[PDB]
Design a protein around this ligand. Structure first.
Ligand SMILES: *[C@@H](C[N+](=O)[O-])[C@H](C[C@@H]1CCNC1=O)NC(=O)[C@H](CC(C)C)NC(=O)c1cc2c(OC)cccc2[nH]1
Ligand SMILES: *[C@@H](C[N+](=O)[O-])[C@H](C[C@H]1CCNC1=O)NC(=O)[C@H](CC(C)C)NC(=O)c1cc2c(OC)cccc2[nH]1
Lengths: 305, 301
């Protein structure tokens, strides 16, 4: 027992991290088979970044302007293309450490592990959630661009995030592995403002189910509710409404505790419309919203990869 | 910018995790060169664990009683010994993935990454601190024993922890890689209580510095205090004393933020006296003590 923020083990992603340099600009890339994926702004100088034209800057670049390195070992670039905000660089060597993988585009509320990297080189791993306003409350310094976020689905790595920028509020924004931004953000040296953020309701429920599993269940009331009524009340508290997928993924925790999704919702509706008194849940007066239902089962059940 | 509980990348340790079976008990071992390290209680039955005499249990075993598994491949055990609570299994194959490594014993207040494993397979990685009462607040189920804790410096893995026990309070106990327990615990099947746990003051200060670096200044004041006066109040609330060494190690965070360590001590004393009045610091409702000054420097410079 115990309940921690746990990242997936990072080894399969570590064997895929490379350095990509165009002139003086160095950032991180992901080497899967004979392609390296990285942020397209590697082709910019400091001054270009202000308001770049990426088609115009790329047309002037050839394979031989790109330095890809695995540690201090050069991989020759034999092709390049831009796909949205990502650059794909074909290289002469198939990565012998390529895991089984997919490119996934995640929903707000979903968590993933970030492998923070500097000059190709993994530095740290932590667990994040995609916020409802399409930011992540990450930890990133200069040189971190192209660090990836991922889930592991047994032997399969699912890549969901590539890091591109820090908003003025110190939160972070990036793309899926096809170079489409999460949220309305653009890759430009421009101060961009995120939407007002909300609490991830499905994740708070998952945490409530985790408490109940650990025999802390004082907050169970005798009520139920409709999904719609709950969704209308939850939006008044700055809480994300629930989808049919949200109800479905709470299924296993519902089955294991014997508590219907809509009874737990009615319990959480009373928590918002009342507060905690000064009482605690899993030792906390703050409701945690960065554990998914899968995060609660994976960790309470010891799932491996 | 931003601040997160961050673990070391796990890859160099994942390459060393193996499954160890003796009779009906399976747990994790650490395969470095031609040795597999694992908890010794794997030689025990549901009888033995109640009051095991491990010298006796071990002399009654041979190599063939130990089934080591690295992926799909069984490893041949060509010898065995015991160093305190850790079993050493000599095998006929050296681990090609053996990183540069040391065995260190860490001090209370120091942090490390844990790679939680089940049946020799990695499940999860998280950051922990050795509590002053030599417990850790981990996340560990049945099968987790032999999971290791570690720091990485350059290409050197410093192993500092192997997992053995859950206490009734739901915290965790285990050994260094020489098989000496952190704290007054024993690898027996019994309820064991720990000493009263103190808060790691130097770590709470580092985290307040992290908070200020991330633009979070509400708890600051224009009071100051002596070190002794701060320590009188800290000790009253079951916080560890702050030493001059601790003050010195906060230096770089004081210099970065332009807040003198004793001015941050004055902030912490007000927080201990008044509480946080429903407010949060870096998204926490409680004073966090599992980040070292170095953890803060590493992430905030
Ligand atoms: C990666 C770039 N690289 O390594 O090549 C960084 C990661 C940032 C830096 C600090 N913390 C992080 O997460 N990306 C950037 O610096 C990014 C580059 C653009 C995509 C071209 N810019 C920003 O993240 C940025 C720019 C501004 C700004 O413009 C003057 C004002 C306010 C905030 C801001 N953030
Ligand atoms: C690992 C064993 N393995 O083969 O994997 C176990 C660690 C898990 C258990 C669930 N949570 C964890 O961290 N270790 C044990 O189960 C350990 C075995 C002895 C050292 C031989 N025992 C305990 O952790 C234990 C026993 C106990 C007790 O005895 C009657 C009463 C209250 C709490 C207890 N915890």
């Amino acid at each position: 027992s115990g309940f921690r923020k746990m990242a997936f083990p990072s080894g399969k992603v570590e064997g895929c991290m490379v350095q990509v340099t165009c002139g003086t600009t160095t950032l991180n890339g992901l080497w899967l088979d004979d392609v390296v994926y990285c942020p397209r702004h590697v082709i910019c100088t400091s001054e270009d970044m202000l308001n770049p034209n990426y088609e115009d800057l790329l047309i002037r670049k050839s394979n031989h302007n790109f330095l890809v390195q695995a540690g201090n070992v050069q991989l020759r670039v034999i092709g390049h293309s831009m796909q949205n905000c990502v650059l794909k660089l074909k290289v002469d060597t198939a990565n012998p450490k390529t895991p089984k993988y997919k490119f996934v585009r995640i929903q707000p509320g979903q968590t993933f592990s970030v492998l923070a990297c500097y000059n190709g080189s993994p530095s740290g791993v932590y667990q994040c959630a995609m916020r409802p306003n399409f930011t992540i409350k990450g930890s990133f310094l200069n040189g971190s661009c192209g660090s990836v976020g991922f889930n592991i689905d047994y032997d399969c790595v699912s890549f969901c995030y590539m890091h591109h920028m820090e908003l003025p509020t110190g939160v972070h924004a990036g793309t899926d592995l096809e170079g489409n931004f999460y949220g309305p953000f653009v890759d430009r040296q421009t101060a961009q403002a995120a939407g007002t953020d909300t609490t991830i309701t499905v994740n708070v429920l998952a945490w409530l189910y985790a408490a109940v599993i650990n025999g802390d269940r004082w907050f169970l009331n005798r009520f139920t509710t409709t999904l719609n009524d709950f969704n209308l009340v939850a939006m008044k508290y700055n809480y994300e409404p629930l989808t049919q997928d949200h109800v479905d993924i709470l299924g296993p925790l519902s089955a294991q505790t014997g508590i219907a999704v809509l009874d737990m919702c009615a319990s959480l509706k009373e928590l918002l419309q009342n507060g905690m008194n000064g009482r605690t849940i899993l030792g906390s007066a703050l409701l945690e919203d960065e554990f998914t239902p899968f995060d609660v089962v994976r960790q309470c059940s010891g799932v491996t990869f």
